[PDB]
Each structure stands twice: as structure tokens, then as C-alpha cells.
Amino acid sequence: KVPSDIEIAQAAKMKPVMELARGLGIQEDEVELYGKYKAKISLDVYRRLKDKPDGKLILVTAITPTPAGEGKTTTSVGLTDALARLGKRVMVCLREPSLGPSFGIKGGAAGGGYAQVVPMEDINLHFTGDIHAVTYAHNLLAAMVDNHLQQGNVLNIDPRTITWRRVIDLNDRALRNIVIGLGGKANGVPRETGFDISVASEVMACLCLASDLMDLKERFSRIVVGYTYDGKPVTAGDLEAQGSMALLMKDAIKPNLVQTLENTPAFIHGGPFANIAHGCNSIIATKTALKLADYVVTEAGFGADLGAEKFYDVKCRYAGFKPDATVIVATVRALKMHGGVPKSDLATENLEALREGFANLEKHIENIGKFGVPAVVAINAFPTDTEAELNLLYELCAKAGAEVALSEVWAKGGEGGLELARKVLQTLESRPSNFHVLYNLDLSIKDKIAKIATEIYGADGVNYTAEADKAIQRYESLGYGNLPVVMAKTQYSFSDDMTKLGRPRNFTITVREVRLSAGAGFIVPITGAIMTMPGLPKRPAACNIDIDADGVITGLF
Amino acid sequence: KVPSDIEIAQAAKMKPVMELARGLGIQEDEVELYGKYKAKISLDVYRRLKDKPDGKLILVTAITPTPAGEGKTTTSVGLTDALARLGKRVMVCLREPSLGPSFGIKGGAAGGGYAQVVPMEDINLHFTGDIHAVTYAHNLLAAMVDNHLQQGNVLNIDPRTITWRRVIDLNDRALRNIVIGLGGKANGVPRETGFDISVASEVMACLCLASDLMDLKERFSRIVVGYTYDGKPVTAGDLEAQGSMALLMKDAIKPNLVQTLENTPAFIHGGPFANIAHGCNSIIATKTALKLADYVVTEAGFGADLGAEKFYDVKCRYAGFKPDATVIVATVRALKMHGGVPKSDLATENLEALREGFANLEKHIENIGKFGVPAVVAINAFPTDTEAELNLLYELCAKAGAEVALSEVWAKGGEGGLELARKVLQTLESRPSNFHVLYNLDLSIKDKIAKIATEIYGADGVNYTAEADKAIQRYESLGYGNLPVVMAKTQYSFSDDMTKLGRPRNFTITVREVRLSAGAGFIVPITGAIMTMPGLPKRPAACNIDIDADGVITGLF
Amino acid sequence: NLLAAMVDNHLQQGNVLNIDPRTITWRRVIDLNDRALRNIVIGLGGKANGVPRETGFDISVASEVMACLCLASDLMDLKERFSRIVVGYTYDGKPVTAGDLEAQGSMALLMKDAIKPNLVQTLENTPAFIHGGPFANIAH
């Protein structure tokens, strides 16, 4: 049988999200429809269920990404289906994807196979407009910065230091580096700047970490946009922009309820970068699903070393959350690559390479342990996976000493994860959690990076360029020394060197630069150029995308 | 006595729009809700009612705009309400406002006082997302032009001839003139360009003039983006972008149902410029309205010399409409300015300056008669007008052969529009229109500009600069010389000089530049500097805007 | 600066050598200390005014032409050296030289007196030559 993910999405029998909401005891007037199959949930649903028991919190993370793929989100939705099959009160919370990729390398299912959140096509495009709202809040601050300079530069901004760029949610490399403000005294003040993809915006990071709209407003007011000629930070707060930015985000601050193909209730809300930001869906979604369900399944971008760590160290930290379980997803095709197998050679089994690659997963496993969180492993199964392999790895997890199940959610739906699901419940009943942040907000910036590189990535140590030192010194000195640290580095290695697969030892990490998100409330060490505006390829999906007299869309997926 | 606009609109008791829809004979599955009080309606309505007769079509326009204000949209909504009170089955169709002005000069009612369409807050902000859709269709085409240059430039476009700019829906003067594609070979091709405000987008003009989604796609394929090194035009179609643009507009193509404060149904859809475009809401909303209702009230931007002329000569020409009557809104104060009274002295009675400024209203009344449409004058009441002023103005209207009514819809809602509405009904009953457009498309471009300039503006003739001559000569030989012409000129005068108020004589107009909108399907001759991207003022409304814990918004209106 | 003018004219006149303007390494010079000329963008104004590209000025004594003067054996060797200067690369990554642009004869003509060393003297009248004056970091 030849099934494609879009066909599965279309054939799905979606339920009115209205009744979905009714059954979680969301009231009528706390729902805000967009069509039959999407809605926004009011912040009142948490403000009322304020003191209700929080359900259980299950983080889904994964091993180190590879060109092979690991299906973190697929198994994350599959596990959600399973729990509801086994009759529990369960929502999955996921990230909203950027619109841009649909016109570049194609859009995809939220999840995969038979473990999707739907309706897929809306999720991939405008959805309920939250990224437009982010784009506008971000770009109005920029317009206002620029208007300030033109109106006499009362705050004495040095235009050449402005760090606030603009955004748009298309992949447009011609906007990476531009000069604006040309054409004369009527037309603004010439300066050098650029655009990043909207999901990279600090506004998107604020959205995702705010508790409520007034909290969002205050974060905005703290954003540093640039410096006076004398070196003094100037903030969005100084430009009186935070009110208008909060008005623009009035609706985007509400989570979007949609659903699984088996009508299990999903929240999709927020979608930051996982390198220069924490890679999680909003705090507002997760804590709402907490009050509303017994079991909240959620995820973080990239491998356990970045997403998981950031989930724990910044998201839970701010939310007061204390996660109960964490699933680490892994595939045999991936761990083989970590064993040194070229991608064109995954057709054969290699039990020797799978023994080699495992060291990756094992490091991730240990890493979860360091947080006080009961691990559990999940193998994403696949056609070419052999039982010799699956057993090997299965026993290697046992030999490693953490819970493990196999998952066939891709091709089997929420049945393919019932085993995994019982594991997690196994784990939730018997193994509490002793969850604590990996470090304290009182250590110096270097101590914090130190602690992350040392325990998590397992570097021998950290070096700093000269301007990394100058920036750190300057931040300590400006008051921003007590913040969490968000490590921007390659996701493809524990180390900062993307060729280093498996579990590299002996290496050290190098901080080349350091940035500040004052509004998000974190410090951003960077270890390599980070790509914040990806470009379109030689033959973009856009060129084959079509929509006909009937509304039939081709080329999109 | 009368509340403010913002308080008026919050105290409004709105009906669920689904109720209004089923009231109109629209089926449930033709309706897509966005909350209880907005919906998008399917183009299937029009299609299944394609054979039904059209209702009566009433255009609302105004005298030449002045700093005194004329109150045109208030008159549209108030007339609509008065018609519903007289028992008529009536809809109003209106433009969506741009998001930008909310943050600069301040947003405002769609209407004013007791004549508004609601929900006001959403209408002014993201509404149902149409403008975000226009922004992204437009900016994706620009991204694809730039990617084409980057990927080897197979079409051999000369980057310096590219006319397709970018858009954003905020007032940002610093984006008027920019240089993009900097950073070296991996970052695009250096070129000079800029942003316009999104509602100025040709994509917005295409939305407003499309008959449906596939016609919109076709229009997209015809947009000229630049020329090759040999001077041949290059289109969106040559770049294969139209399918994607169409996909991005798949919901924006649907008109939006909302309502007046008295619950009369209202469509809001599209919102182009009135100088470089035709200044009307979409053909799609108007034509659907005409099937659903027996009377449809719509309006056009700027005074009757610009919006009414383009309503008749572009929008009616494309759609096959034949307007039945036209209401011209005037005020005592605006006419006194046209007769030489400075703004600071408009309260003082001045029958002689009113008699002189009336020549402005007299010329508009004559102009509407040249399209074969009977005209009724609506006088928006103002507290300081004297009886003798009103009485003189009525006698001058009757001497000019127009019916006239005092309108007090601002203060009294639909009840204040009853005399206006009955004069319109008496006109519809006893003077059927003999509608015809002003000019045949087969005239040369110059003969079309002269017809409009001499007959509508009262100009002696038209001069052209050398650049305007060459442009005209190129477009004629490229095959675009049979299109409608859309004059972009100041709205403050019949002439191209904004300080010639009243009915100026012995003047000539000077066309300085001619541009092409090949997708929207017209030629745009330009007289003075046209501001396609307005700037923020010294103190933007954005600095005063707040929203509190309650969701209470101050500073916005 | 004549070589730079000829590179830019080549782009303007149809770019027959197919230089990628963004790979061009030949900058301009002036012999004043002007930091504002370090990073610039030229060729703006539309199709009649050149090809937009990013470039800058160095101080004249940093010029490779200055290094060539100092290392030439005579005028014809200087002309030859000129013909070998790499100014940028084509879209395929092949180098493009002053020789491919046929500029070396003109450059040589402009240096026809500069190729001659200058006799002056010390305060005690001992004879002295003064001639050429390159950087000591990016040149010798």
C-alpha cells in the first residue's frame, strides 16, 4: 500500500474542536473559533482552573539529529494517541512551524504517518495568524526605533549600534544584509541592518515564555534595541513601544486547539529557534493543558543536549514546572550514522555500527539523569530495521539501565505506542521525579556556560575569543549577569564541530560571540555562524505549487 | 451629548454573524466563522445565485476632501441603516483599513458616532488576516525574483530595472529607499529597491478586481516585475510564482461578513489606494452583495473626481455593474474652505464663501451626470452651521437639479438617514440610470488621460515630461495601450496643485511618470510626488497606546 | 584607479568576461587617511550608472601597483606585472586579470615617469635616491 502523509491528513475524520473543548470543560465563551477545526483558548481557562491539580508533565526529546531523521514529533503524537486509547485525559502540545519552508523545500505533517496533528495545510500556512502578529510587533518596534532617529534622536541612539533587526516569515537571503534610510533628510537616517525569519524573533521567544499578556508587555519593555553614543542601553521600554506591541499580540497570546488524527486534543502555540532560543512551545499552552488534563505530552527542538536542557533550564525554571517523565526518541538508522555509516548505506544492517552509535543515546540518557527526571527510551521503528538490530539496541538500553519500548506509531497510529505508553505510566506510578535546574542564576555567565559544556556536552572546557570576553564583561557590568544561558551552537554534535558524531571526548568548546535577549530574559553564547535567514533552493517548491478551480492543492507536500 | 466612537462601539449589541448569514439565505457550510462576530463567506454563494437579478447599486462619494472633513463612510453606513429601517433588504460593502495608521495618526471607526460597522477593534487590526495574506503573496514574489538572480539569472533580468518592490503594512519611511543583497556571493545580488505600505500593493488591487481565485491567479501571472538586459518584460508567470501567490490568498479571496451598530449586514473586503489604484472594495464583495440584497451601498476613496471616476471606469467596467444612483456627501464647512475660509474661521457664518465653494460640489454633481447616473446630495449636519447656511445650500442644490437631504446619522444613527434614504428611493423609482463608462478602451493612453482630465477635472489639457512620453511609447508598443487609466494625483484639488481649492479654471495637468500594473490591468499616470509609504509623526499614537490586565485598551482611538 | 574604472566599465558594457561583481578584489585608492572610504557601495542610480557592488578604498601606498613599481626591473617588466594582476573571478570561479581587460598598456603609460628613481640628497650633500614606498605588512 502506498500512503502519503497529506492523503492521511485529508482522509482523517476531524471533530469540531468545539466539542473537543467542551469535553475538557472549556466553556463555550472561552473558545474562539477559526472555522470548525481550529480555535483559540482564552487565558481564563488557566486563570480560573488556577489552583486545580496540575496533571503529569511528559517531555519528549531525542538523540542528536542526523540526516537520517528520528521522528521526535511523530512519536510525540503517537504516544499521545496511545495514552488516550488506554483511556487517559491527555493533550499533546506542539510548536507552530514557519510559513517559509512550505515555499522552499516543502511543508510537512505536524508529526508523521498516522501520528499527525491536523488540519495540516493550515498549520503550515497562516494558521491562526500568530506569526503575523509576532512579525508586526517586531517590525513596529523597528519602525519606531527608526522614527525616533528621524525625529531628532532624543535618546541619543548611535544608529550604527542598533541590534534590533526586522523580520519576515519567508526564506529571503537578499534581506540578510541591507542598507536602509536612503534618499535624503525626508527619508530617514541611513544605516546597515537586515531581516531574520520571523520565528527567530525575540518577540517569538517572549511569546513563548510569557505567563500572560501583562507579562509579555513587560518583557517587551525590557528589550534592548541598541546603545546611545555613550554606551548606555536603550530599550523598547525607553521608546514607549511595549503597549502597542502587546496590543498587536492580543490574540496571539492564546493557544490554538486543533487535534490528532484520532481526535485526541492538541495545542499548537509558538515556535522559536532551538539555537538562539529554547526551542519549546509556549509556557501558556503547556500550563493550560496542565490544568486541563492528567497527562501533558510536549517537546523541545533539536537533540536532548539543546532542547531538553533548555526546556529544563529555562522553560521549567520560569514556569515553576517540575517534569515527571522524559522520553528520548532514537532510531537505528540514526544511531548507525552516529556509528559512522554514510546515509546511502543504511539499507544494510550494521550491528557493529549500532553498537558504536549507541554511545550518543547513552550520553543523552545520562544527561536526563543529571536533572532528576526519570528517562524512558523509545525506538522509532522503520521498514529496513532488522530484529537483530532492534534487539541489540533494546538490550543496550537495558544494559544501559533505563526503561525502553519500541514504537510503530508511524504506520500503526496510537496502537503502535501502547507499549511505550504503558512504560511511561509504569514510570509515572513508580519512579517519582527529583527535578532541579542544572545550575543557579547566581553563578557568573562563564560558570554557567562552563557547567553546561562540562556536564551536558562533556567538553573538557570552554575558550572565549576576545570580543566574547568584552561582551560578557559588558553584560555582567550592565546588570544582565544573573540570567539563564542559551547556547547557540551546532545541533549535529555534542561539540561545536558538526563533523563530530557519536560521543566525542577530548574536545573543548569555543564561544566566539555573546548576545543578549533582555526581553526573553536570557544570554546567548554562540559558537559558530548561526543561520537566522535561510535561503530558497535552486528549484523552490513555490515553482510547482498550484491550486486549481476545485481548491485542489498540488506541489505543497 | 453624543458619546465617543470607541465607547459607542463597545456598547453595541451585535448579532451572531451566522444568524445574519442565514438571514440572507447563505447556508451554514458557506460560512467560516472567526469568533461569533466575523465570517468569511464562500464564493459558492455567488456561483449558485449567478442567475438571480442584481439589487440596486448605490455609490457613495464626496466633494473634494478638505481639512474640515466631509464624513463619507459615516454617510454610507448611516444610509444603509436608514434603508433597513425603511424595511429594505440592504447591505453595505466597505474597504478594510490598513493596520499602519492605527499606530501613527490614530485608527478610527469604520464610520463614526452612531454609524459604524463592528467589531471596530478587529477591523482596524488583524481583522481576518487578508492584508497579511496580501503582504506574503507580494513578498514571496519579490523573494522569488531575488532567488532567480541568485541561482544564475536564467531569464537574464537586469536587476536594475526591477519594479516589483516589497511591502509591509506599517508606516516606515526608512524602508522607502534601500539597497539589499549585500554580504557577498552567498547573500544575493546587490540592488536598489524599497518597501511600500501593503494596501498600496498591486496584489491588493488584484484581489479587489478579481472575479474569483482562478482569475486572481491569472492576474498574478501577468504582473510585470522588471525587464531583461534586452528590454523585454519579465512576469510573475515567467517565474512560475502565481500558484503560490494564489495559494497564499486562498482564504483572502473570500469577503468578510460583519455588521453595523443596528445589525444591518456588511461586507468588508480589500482596501487599495485611491491614487495609484482605484480606491474601492472588492468586486467579489459587491457582486455577492447584489445577489443577496435588493439594495447595495458601497463607496470609493477620495472625492468623486478620483474614487467615483475609477469606480465607474475600472470596477464597474470589469464587473458589468450599472450603478443606479450616487450619493455625494458634502458639508457646509468643507464648502466654505473651498470658497476661501481658513480652517480656524469655519464657524463664522459666511453665505458668500459658501456660495463660492459650492462650485466644487456643482462640478462633482455635473461629473456624475456624465456617467448617466442620477445624483443625490447628502449634507452631513454640523452643530455650528446656521439655518441660513443650510437653506442657501439646499437652494443651490435644487438650482443644480439635485435632490438633497440633511443627514444626521452621526448623532442619530439610521433615524438620521431617513430623509436621505427616502430621497434615494424616490430617485431609484423615478429616474433609472443610463450608466456608461466615460471612455472606450481603444483610445490611446493620451486620449484617455485627456478625456478624464478635461471632462472630469475641468483641465484645459495635459502636458507630459520626456520620461512620461517614453514610458507611454514603450507600454503602447508592448501591447498595454488598450487598458483603463488610473490617474494618481492629489485628492485635494480638481487640479494637480493641492492649493487650488474650489473649482479652478485655466489650468493644465502635468503627467511626470507613467507606471504599469499589468496584473490589476491598468496604466497609472502620476502627477506629483505620490507617497506609497507614509511615515510616522513626531509623536506616534504608538507611544500612547496601552492595554491592561483587563484587556482595556487606551490611546488607540 | 584606472584599472578599477575599467573593471566597472566592463560590467556596465555587457560583462563579456562574465566576472562575478561580488568576487572582485581590486579596490580603489587615495593617498589620504579617510576611514569613511573603507567600506562603500558604488554603481547606484540605475542602469545608466553602473553595477551596484560593495568595495572600498585603501591608502595609495598600500596599492599592489606600488608593490609592482618597487619590484619591477624596468617599464616593460612593470607592464607585464600589471597584466598579471588578478582583479576578481567569473561566475565559474576562474580568475580574471588586468591582462584580460587589456589595461596594462595604459597603466604602464601612466607610470612612464614614475618608473624613474628620484635624486635628492642629505643635509651634507651626499647623494640619495627616493623611490617607491609600499606597506611593510601586506607588502615587502
Q: How far is A60 from chain B (nearest CA, A)?
A: 32
Residues 6+ apart with CB under 8 A from B27: none
Q: A317 with A426, same domain?
A: yes
- Cell numbers 533587526: residue: A165
Kindly list the distances between the CA atom of residue C2 and the CA atoms of A70, A529, A548, C110, C111, in Å, as whole numbers in the listed order.
58, 37, 57, 9, 12
Q: How far is A215 from chain B (nearest CA, A)?
A: 10
Q: Which residue, A473, A547, A460, is CA-closest to A514?
A: A473
Say which of C47, C51, C52 has its CB closest to residue B161.
C47
DSSP state letter for B36? S
Q: Are C135 and C61 in contact (CB under 8 A)?
A: yes
Q: Is A71 annotated as a binding residue?
A: yes
B160 to C52: CB separation less than 8 angstroms, yes or no = yes
Q: How far is B137 from chain A (nearest CA, A)?
A: 10
Task: Tell me how many domains chain A contains.
Answer: 3
DSSP state letter for A56? E
Kindly list the distances between the CA atom of residue B376 and the CA atoms of B388, B392, B431, in Å, as whole numbers in the listed order.
21, 17, 11
Q: B303 with B425, same domain?
A: yes
B179 to C46: CB separation less than 8 angstroms, yes or no = no
Q: Are A471 and A424 in contact (CB under 8 A)?
A: no
**Residue to substitute from A247, A248, A543, A556, interface B, most B β-carbons within 10 A:** A247
C-alpha span between A24 and B514 (Å, rounded): 60
Residues in chain B with CB shorter than 8 Å from the CB of C39 are: none
Does B152 touch chain C if contact means CB atoms closer than 8 Å? yes
Asked whether residue A539 is domain-assigned, the answer is no
**Residue to substitute from B157, B158, B160, B179, interface C, most C β-carbons within 10 A:** B160
**At C28, phi and psi to the nearest 5?**
-110, 175
Q: Which residues of B belong to the active site? A: 72, 74, 95, 106, 274, 302, 382, 410
The secondary element (H helix, E strand) that includes residue B6 is: helix B5-10
- Cell numbers 467579489: residue: B284
DSSP state letter for A490? -
**Residue to substitute from A40, A122, A128, A175, interface B, most B β-carbons within 10 A:** A175
Does C60 touch chain B if contact means CB atoms closer than 8 Å? no
The type of residue at A255 is P
Hey, what's the cell of A355? 553498537
DSSP state letter for A306? I
- Chains contacting B (3+ CB pairs below 8 angstroms): A, C
Q: Are B493 and B64 in contact (CB under 8 A)?
A: yes
Point out the annotated binding site of B for ATP.
Answer: 66-73
The type of residue at B27 is Q
* SS3 category, B235: strand
Residues 6+ apart with CB under 8 A from B43: B212, B213, B253, B254, B284, B288
CATH number at residue A487: 3.10.410.10
Q: How far is B143 from chain C (nearest CA, A)?
A: 19
Return the number of other C-beta atoms located less than 10 Å from residue A546's C-beta. 17
Residues in chain B with CB shorter than 8 Å from the CB of A175 are: 180
Q: How far is B538 from chain A (nearest CA, A)?
A: 6
DSSP state letter for A312? I
Q: Is A386 annotated as a binding residue?
A: no
A214 to B103: CB separation less than 8 angstroms, yes or no = no
A319 a catalytic residue: no
C-alpha span between B438 and B448 (Å, rounded): 9
Q: Are B135 and A523 in contact (CB under 8 A)?
A: no
Asked whether residue B296 is domain-assigned, the answer is yes
- Closest-CA residue of B relative to A549 is B214
Q: A416 with A472, same domain?
A: no
Q: A42 with A110, same domain?
A: yes
* SS3 category, B176: coil
Return the number of other C-beta atoms located less than 10 Å from residue B329's C-beta. 27
Experimental determination approach used? X-ray
Hey, what's the cell of B103? 499606530
Domain-ending residue, one of A229, A248, A267: A248
C-alpha span between A503 and B51 (Å, rounded): 72
Under 8 Å CB pairs connecting chains B and C tally to 30
Residues 6+ apart with CB under 8 A from A232: none
Residues in chain B with CB shorter than 8 Å from the CB of A136 are: 99, 169-170
* SS3 category, A137: helix
Residues 6+ apart with CB under 8 A from A446: A462, A464, A472
Residues in chain C with CB shorter than 8 Å from the CB of B158 are: 47
**Residue to substitute from A121, A170, A220, A244, interface B, most B β-carbons within 10 A:** A244
C-alpha span between A286 and A305 (Å, rounded): 21
Strands C40-42 and C53-55, bridge-based pairing: antiparallel
Asked whether residue B554 is domain-assigned, the answer is no
**At A553, phi and psi to the nearest 5?**
-95, 120
Asked whether residue B555 is domain-assigned, the answer is no
DSSP state letter for B455? I
Asked whether residue B538 is domain-assigned, the answer is no
A321 a catalytic residue: no
Q: A240 with A171, same domain?
A: yes
Q: Which 3-state string (H, E, C) describes chain C?
A: CHHHHHHHHHHHCCCCCCECHHHCCCCEEECCCCHHHCCEEECCCCHHHCCCEEECEEEHHHCHHHHHHHHCCCHHHHHHHHHHCEEEEECCCCEEECCCCCCHHHHHHHCCCCCCCEEEECCCCCEEEECCCCCCCCCC
Hey, what's the cell of A3? 500512503
Q: Which residue, A117, A118, A114, is CA-closest to A407?
A: A114
Residues in chain A with CB shorter than 8 Å from the CB of B133 are: 126
**Residue to substitute from A131, A173, A533, interface B, most B β-carbons within 10 A:** A173
Strand partners, B179: A179, B192
B143 to A172: CB separation less than 8 angstroms, yes or no = yes
DSSP state letter for B3? -
Residues in chain B with CB shorter than 8 Å from the CB of C19 are: none
Hey, what's the cell of A340? 559512522
Does A250 touch chain B if contact means CB atoms closer than 8 Å? yes
Instruction: Please give the resolution of this entry in Å, rounded to 1 decimal.
Output: 2.2
Q: How far is C90 from chain B (nearest CA, A)?
A: 12
Asked whether residue A483 is domain-assigned, the answer is yes
Asked whether residue B557 is domain-assigned, the answer is no
C-alpha span between A421 and A407 (Å, rounded): 10
Give B 197-216 residues with CB within 8 A of chain A.
213-214
Cα dihedral: A392, A394, A398, A403 (round 10): 170
Q: Is B290 left (phi over 0), alpha (psi -120 to 50) or beta?
A: alpha
Residues in chain B with CB shorter than 8 Å from the CB of A173 are: 146-147, 150, 186-188
Burial A417-443 (b: 16+ CB within 10 A, else e): bbebbebbbbbbeeeebebeebbeeee
- Chains contacting C (3+ CB pairs below 8 angstroms): B
- Write the DSSP assignment of A211-260 as a string of letters: SSHHHHHHHHHH-EEEEBTTS-EEETTTTT-HHHHHHHTTTTTS-EEEEE
Q: B125 with B151, same domain?
A: no
Asked whether residue B551 is domain-assigned, the answer is no
The type of residue at B469 is D
**Alpha-carbon radius of gyration of chain B:** 23
Strand partners, A234: A226
Domain-ending residue, one of B223, B248, B273: B248
Hey, what's the cell of C7? 573593471
Strands A522-526 and A513-517, bridge-based pairing: antiparallel
- Closest-CA residue of C relative to B152 is C91
- Write the DSSP assignment of B308-329 as a string of letters: IHHIIIIIIHHHT----EEEEE
Q: B234 with B266, same domain?
A: no
C-alpha span between A282 and A205 (Å, rounded): 9
Q: Which residue, A129, A189, A191, is CA-closest to A165?
A: A191
B185 to C41: CB separation less than 8 angstroms, yes or no = no
Q: How far is C15 from chain B (nearest CA, A)?
A: 11
C-alpha span between B269 and B134 (Å, rounded): 12
B32 to A32: CB separation less than 8 angstroms, yes or no = no
Does B538 touch chain A if contact means CB atoms closer than 8 Å? yes
Point out the catalytic residue in the list A38, A40, A56, A95: A95
Hey, what's the cell of A489? 551552537
Q: How far is C14 from chain B (nearest CA, A)?
A: 9
Domain-ending residue, one of B443, B474, B492: B443
Q: Are B89 and B64 in contact (CB under 8 A)?
A: no
Q: A367 with A485, same domain?
A: no
The type of residue at B521 is G
Angle at Cα B460 formed by Cα B60 and Cα B524, nearest 5°?
A: 55
Residues in chain A with CB shorter than 8 Å from the CB of B248 are: 125-126
Residues 6+ apart with CB under 8 A from C124: none
Q: A498 with A392, same domain?
A: no
Does B247 touch chain A if contact means CB atoms closer than 8 Å? yes
- Write the DSSP assignment of B190-223 as a string of letters: -EEE-EEEGGG-HHHHHHHH-SSHHHHHHHHHH-
- Closest-CA residue of A relative to B171 is A143
Q: B234 with B267, same domain?
A: no
Kindly list the distances between the CA atom of residue A419 and the CA atoms of A68, A230, A414, B398, in Å, as whole numbers in the listed order.
24, 62, 10, 87
Q: B144 with B191, same domain?
A: yes
Does B47 touch chain A if contact means CB atoms closer than 8 Å? no
Q: Are B380 and B74 in contact (CB under 8 A)?
A: yes
CATH number at residue C1: 3.30.1510.10
- Closest-CA residue of C relative to B163 is C46
C-alpha span between B308 and A328 (Å, rounded): 65
Residues in chain C with CB shorter than 8 Å from the CB of B160 are: 46-47, 51-52
Q: Are A285 and A270 in contact (CB under 8 A)?
A: yes
Give C 91-110 residues with CB within 8 A of chain B.
91
Axis-axis angle for helices A387-400, A359-369 (nearest 10) = 30
C-alpha span between A450 and A511 (Å, rounded): 11
B182 to C41: CB separation less than 8 angstroms, yes or no = yes
Strand stretches in A478-540, DSSP E:
509-511, 513-517, 522-526
C47 to B179: CB separation less than 8 angstroms, yes or no = no
Q: B486 with B403, same domain?
A: no
Which domain does B244 fall in, by range?
130-248
* SS3 category, A308: helix
Burial A320-339 (b: 16+ CB within 10 A, else e): ebebbbbbbbbbbbbbbbbb
* SS3 category, A159: helix
